[PDB]
Amino acid sequence: QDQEFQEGFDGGWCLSVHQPWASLLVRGIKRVEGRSWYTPHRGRLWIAATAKKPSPQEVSELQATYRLLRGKDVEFPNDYPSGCLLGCVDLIDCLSQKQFKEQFPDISQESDSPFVFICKNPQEMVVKFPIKGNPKIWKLDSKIHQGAKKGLMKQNKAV
């Protein structure tokens, strides 16, 4: 077998996430994503922002929460664009609450969900591609994926 080997390939898979959480994921400010379902997916996972347009107050209050969770001096993006492919993370593991609490006791407070997607290596594209989303973890159009792999990434500052 070769589990680590197969997961190292980028299969062009995507998760749709509402703003403001979507941009927080590709910036590394949000480092776990909770869901009520279990995924066997491991490795590269592209992040698309849905069509939702959060209000300025919603963004402001979520920023205040992530400052409390991550540190008072954490910096945030000026824009949380809707309806586009933002970048990617690497999905390291999909943990139950029990596993998340014992493996990550200092940060388990960051997700209360039945399953917790452990995200590493956040990358944000400079050019973001308009895209329609789908449920769960879904397959990017091949041409979109090809463009995303070629696309210039920002060197974001560490959180």
Domains of the chain: 3-150 (2.30.130.30)
For CA atoms 58, 62, 67, 73, the dihedral sign is negative
C-alpha separations of 86 from 2, 36, 60, 90, 114 in Å: 30, 23, 20, 14, 26
Nearest-angstrom CA–CA distance, 81 and 42? 26
| CB distance 28 to 86 below 8 Å | no
Neighbouring CB atoms inside 10 A of 76's CB total 17
Strands 13-17 and 43-49: parallel
Q: Which of 89, 86, 80 is nearest to 127 (CA)?
A: 86
Tokens of residue 33, six digits: 């994503």
Q: Which residues pair with 120 in a beta bridge?
A: 90
